[PDB]
Amino acid sequence: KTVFHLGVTEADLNGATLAIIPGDPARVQKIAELMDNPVFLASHREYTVYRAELDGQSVVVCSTGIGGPSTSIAVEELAQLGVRTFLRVGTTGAIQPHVNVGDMIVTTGSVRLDGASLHFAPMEFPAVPDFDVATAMKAAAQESGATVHMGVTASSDTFYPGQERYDTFTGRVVRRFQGSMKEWQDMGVLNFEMESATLLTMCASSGLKAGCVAGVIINRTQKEIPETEARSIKVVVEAARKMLK
Amino acid sequence: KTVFHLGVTEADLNGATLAIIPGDPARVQKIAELMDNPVFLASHREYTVYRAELDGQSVVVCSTGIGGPSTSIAVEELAQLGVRTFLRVGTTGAIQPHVNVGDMIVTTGSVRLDGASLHFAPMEFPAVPDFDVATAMKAAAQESGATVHMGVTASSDTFYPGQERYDTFTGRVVRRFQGSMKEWQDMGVLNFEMESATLLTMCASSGLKAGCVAGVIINRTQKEIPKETEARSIKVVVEAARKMLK
Amino acid sequence: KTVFHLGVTEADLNGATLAIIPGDPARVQKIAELMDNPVFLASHREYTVYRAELDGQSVVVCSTGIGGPSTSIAVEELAQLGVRTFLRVGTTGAIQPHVNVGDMIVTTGSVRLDGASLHFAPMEFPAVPDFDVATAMKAAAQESGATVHMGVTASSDTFYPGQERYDTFTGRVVRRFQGSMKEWQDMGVLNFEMESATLLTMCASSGLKAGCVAGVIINRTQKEIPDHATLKETEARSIKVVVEAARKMLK
Amino acid sequence: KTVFHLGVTEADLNGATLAIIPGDPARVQKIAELMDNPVFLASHREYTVYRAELDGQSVVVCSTGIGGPSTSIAVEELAQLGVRTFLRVGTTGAIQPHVNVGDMIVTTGSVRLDGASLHFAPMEFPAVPDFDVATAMKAAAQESGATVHMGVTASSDTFYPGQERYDTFTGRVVRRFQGSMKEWQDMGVLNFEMESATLLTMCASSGLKAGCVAGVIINRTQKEIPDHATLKETEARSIKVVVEAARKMLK
Amino acid sequence: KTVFHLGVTEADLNGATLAIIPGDPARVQKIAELMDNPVFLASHREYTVYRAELDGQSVVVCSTGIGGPSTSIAVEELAQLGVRTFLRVGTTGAIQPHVNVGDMIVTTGSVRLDGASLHFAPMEFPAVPDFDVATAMKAAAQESGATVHMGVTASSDTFYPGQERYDTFTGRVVRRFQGSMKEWQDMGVLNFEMESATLLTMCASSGLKAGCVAGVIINRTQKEIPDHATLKETEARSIKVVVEAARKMLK
Amino acid sequence: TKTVFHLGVTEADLNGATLAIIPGDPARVQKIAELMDNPVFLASHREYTVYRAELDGQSVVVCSTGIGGPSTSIAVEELAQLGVRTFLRVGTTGAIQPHVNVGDMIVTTGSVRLDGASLHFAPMEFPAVPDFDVATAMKAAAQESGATVHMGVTASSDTFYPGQERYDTFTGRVVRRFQGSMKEWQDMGVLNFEMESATLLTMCASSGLKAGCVAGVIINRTQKEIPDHATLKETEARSIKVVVEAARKMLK
């Protein structure tokens, strides 16, 4: 059995039904090495795939690249190969002043500012994580000693206008996203990232278990553009450990 | 002091920051009596308000009536009077064949088939419960010996076409909702009700903590038209409230 | 035989094909007693059901509760039991300075700021009353001697942000409804209520005859506070009108 | 003062506050001559404008052309020149089997299957006629001896796919409109035309009185090719009705 | 054999597979006379139809009237009569300060501020001209010595609020279009007209080749009242360009 | 002076380049760069591999976009901040018209916006349209390579599977919106599916940037035959040859 993009087979996964899915291909090996016997499987495009053992159980680590589209491909093809549980880890920008750099966020629900989520469920469907994964992620994050926030994540198909950044080439933002950061802020939204809406909606509507944990590397009340990453991947691995049956 | 609809003042609530919000006004006293010193506060329209004490702390029980609109009023006016945590309990129709009558469902997210939620946040915003409330509801429901399901709830502004019932006056359902139950079913949606989308969206976007627990009284794979489930449901929401009390 | 929510049967209605549908269950008896032989049928949730006779014909009075969702249930279940005509009565807040407290509004069309209407017809479908019912309601309202306004009603799924109220817990109104009050006022919208859009859309698309008449009890463009005698009279006149409107609808 | 398209001035209208607005420029003179002292004012593009007198009061007749866009231009520019009341008359195709060819329809609300209405009010706003105009049209229609239907009109930006016609170049209808006629039929929609949604929405949200009356030229459940003598009689009656409706509005 | 509105037959067209479609009925003759053996075919409503010969090949010239609805009818019925290629020429108002009065615009894509386009394809579908037609139009326009702009055209279902004109009867513009002018300007949109969105979307989704070329009559950042000689020269240049564009499209 | 956050390059790194060639695959970046003079690796972060090269004495950037509008929008934006004004998109595609063969080339004249990122630059009404000069240069270059070239509409999806109505998936389910969508696009004359054009074109057309998309057809959803290996390899090489030629035409 083969897949179009990931360059791996079901056999390469060694019966793994859980995958950790960072965005950056270069973080895949780093995640894999936190577990036992990390093995490089394949590397094509933004998709770097590693396999490792966690408490004697096979775990896949597969980068998604940036954004819902490349993420949806990874999730689908991993699903075709037996993966049922997806643990998202990444960096994020906080929009609440009380959420500090270094804090960890576990997404209880995503504002669907993406297009890919709509390819699995209409907008009315909630971009919500599997409750067990969100629970495992909260537990792993809190046990690590990190400061953890459970709440809503604004998930944008763009890094710049969709997160209302103005230090850009045009220096402007389409009507929809003008004043949007303050809007999300007033609505209690914790942070911005770019994959959770797609991942959560796709999985919640496909019989797949998913959750998102993110390390805050910037607070948007302070500035627009930028370890926390190291602690984040330790957390997602322990979250994976908690998810293992 | 005094809110437009609920007919109660902040002083009436005795410092209560948590509310249990059933739909049926007749359920209010039944919930209240499970706690200490229940007292009738006011009854206006579909809004019946009791105050009670749970482990020393004041707790409000307030009916919402059916639907997001009447619910949004209760939640807002209770919020004006200092309530920050809202525990929804009610009945629901399951759409998954493995979810049985008597089971309980704690909503982890609502399909927003309502209009009121849009008055607090755009459709992209997730109709999501507070995690502590959802966690407390699961624990409470499990401890009661009930079979508990965590998952997505379809929350409809109508009981009939929005939940794709056909045994109706017209026997007709608008295009949007034709085949919708099968669609939600394939998407793993657990059940139908009418208040969660509004409640969850409103609270999640207003700095209020909310969650929903529901006793399944009908499985929609079996039929369209629906008491031990009733009694167990309110005991759970009270225990969930106890877990939430700080 | 017995509808799930209203807890009544077709026999309970005594052949009634017309329902008067106030929002407040406590108003149901008051309306019923304006007619002959008022009889309490059932009371469940926000649904209080009476039956009465008007010119020898059975009329149902059934409360809807607040909002389109609970309203849609009452209308549907009454329709299952043979009711074909629905007369909405209540009180409302005017948003036009020329519309005074005590005046009455007959809705010719509703701004669909609700969600339940979408469960019967897509947004492009007009939330309009049956022409005969609107005609009857206008006639009854004018014959009562009150000043009557025929126009568009903003029908909101919320009492607060959807009607751009800022005196709230958050004090915040979502982008969609920011400045919406001014917008509706400029478009000539007469008033805000919370059931008409659902009711009118549901009925106009389901072969049911419906209309809405309301007594103006407050005006948000006027800082003046109406006296208790005016509010009481308005409340009484509104239900007097809807019963006379029913009388005109009877065949 | 001058306008951009109609080529008429306020002085040309001689104080007219009411306009009868047919779709076909050829129909303008036919309407005008039913009144006193018809005078050709201008003819630019689809806009043929006549002035006439009805019971001593100036009345403007102005064609709209086909569709909301050209209609919205006419209504706006007439409004700039002092016109406050607009009486739409036009041909239509019925979609209900109980509505016969030769019957008349007065629109109580329009299904907004257009785009121009959205330029005046969001979709939730009802495409509703002024109640006096609808009432005047119903009376004038009934008094002409015609069988009159009050109800919802589906108002489409296209003649073909938006009215679900398949006998076309591509024979294709976009997903949105596939099975739409059946849907409108089930929702009790009476007929198709192409201007009412824009007209009613624009006017209802701009402080203008508007209404639509139409002669049924074809029934979509029957045949597309109308019989000549029947068509002629219907069209003659429709313009007589709208003039009488204008008379009722001016009184 | 017979079309519903145009009043012409396939035989009338003499094997013409290309149509030049101006908006103004009066422009049809002007365009036809730029070609050989111009022949008046029919004139009904907005639809003035002429036939002519360009390099020995039949070309039909047909007015569309204002707006997508009347345009969609013309295109469809011409298509039924064998037309496969549609060349749009029309007047436009530019919104970019660098686009001068008298310049020419060839639409590379249209902002779909209309409703009729939605009757052929969902909003996500690009309102895009056929590449050959756009190429031919650009070449014709540039060869004429005109200053030519390739870019996006905002295509509105209204002349007034949809193009954010405030000098109107109400002086009001619905929320959607408030500040929309500035928005389109910042997005590099070149001009406003009222037919391209419908035309381009309809044709690109129906196997029909279409394109739009327009003479800039006014600039919205300047004045609304065009100078007569400048306008005349621009309009004359535009029709010469579209005919030469038609010549390039001839196979 | 600044180094853009994702691409990890500076304005000085680009050597005055105002045109960028933007493939999807990072591995293809060097392959494109070496078709020009003095290719130099600039940076590789995430799915973004950036090379600089020279075409007729003028600096040109080659930068991968990764898969999808979101990652593409980042690349385009940050290159734009560093002075890039013209973006030439090249990539593989799946044709959905029986008259389009594997090995043929498609130049997008407009994109069906089945994405989300495009909405972050312009409302849905706005056309996902290429710059006319870029589309013209791409057509000419494609023709000059001897390829069969198709000018037309491209469906640009945020997903490879349900948004392109693939049913051979984990769920085998396709959401209501996209059920029967393939046939709909086909009947509407849509030529192919890819996953970046709507975002790219909408973003650039509304931001004063020039952009165009050219694509090598590597598969046809209507043809049951398996694409020949030799044709596929030729198509890969031809597509990047064409885009460099298109760049040359755009430069001068």
Ligand SMILES: Cc1cn([C@H]2C[C@H](O)[C@@H](CO)O2)c(=O)[nH]c1=O
């Ligand atoms: C810091 C930061 C990261 N991200 C996410 C998106 C990408 O997947 C990743 C790298 O930018 O981090 C944001 O969306 N917004 C931010 O402010």
Ligand SMILES: Cc1cn([C@H]2C[C@H](O)[C@@H](CO)O2)c(=O)[nH]c1=O
């Ligand atoms: C049994 C059942 C209850 N409900 C909810 C709606 C009301 O709030 C309440 C009473 O009907 O229960 C549904 O929405 N669907 C159902 O099938």
Ligand SMILES: Cc1cn([C@H]2C[C@H](O)[C@@H](CO)O2)c(=O)[nH]c1=O
């Ligand atoms: C005064 C007032 C009443 N109402 C309606 C809503 C309720 O159904 C009813 C009681 O508040 O009156 C409004 O919607 N807006 C108003 O301003």
Ligand SMILES: Cc1cn([C@H]2C[C@H](O)[C@@H](CO)O2)c(=O)[nH]c1=O
């Ligand atoms: C007969 C008929 C007429 N019309 C309208 C549209 C035109 O404005 C006018 C002439 O066709 O009549 C329809 O829209 N649908 C129909 O079926």
Ligand SMILES: Cc1cn([C@H]2C[C@H](O)[C@@H](CO)O2)c(=O)[nH]c1=O
């Ligand atoms: C001058 C001008 C013309 N037009 C078009 C619309 C009509 O089709 C035609 C005549 O006004 O020109 C606009 O849409 N906007 C403008 O500013």
Ligand SMILES: Cc1cn([C@H]2C[C@H](O)[C@@H](CO)O2)c(=O)[nH]c1=O
């Ligand atoms: C063959 C094919 C490729 N693609 C694009 C998406 C990816 O960016 C790239 C590699 O799969 O090609 C499609 O979108 N659909 C298709 O059918």
Ligand SMILES: [Cl-]
């Ligand atoms: Cl990452």
Ligand SMILES: [Cl-]
């Ligand atoms: Cl920071």
Ligand SMILES: [Cl-]
């Ligand atoms: Cl309850």
Ligand SMILES: [Cl-]
């Ligand atoms: Cl049905």
Ligand SMILES: [Cl-]
């Ligand atoms: Cl059951």
Ligand SMILES: [Cl-]
């Ligand atoms: Cl009431």
Ligand SMILES: [Cl-]
């Ligand atoms: Cl007419």
Ligand SMILES: [Cl-]
């Ligand atoms: Cl013209």
Ligand SMILES: [Cl-]
């Ligand atoms: Cl590529």
Ligand SMILES: [Mg+2]
């Ligand atoms: Mg700048």
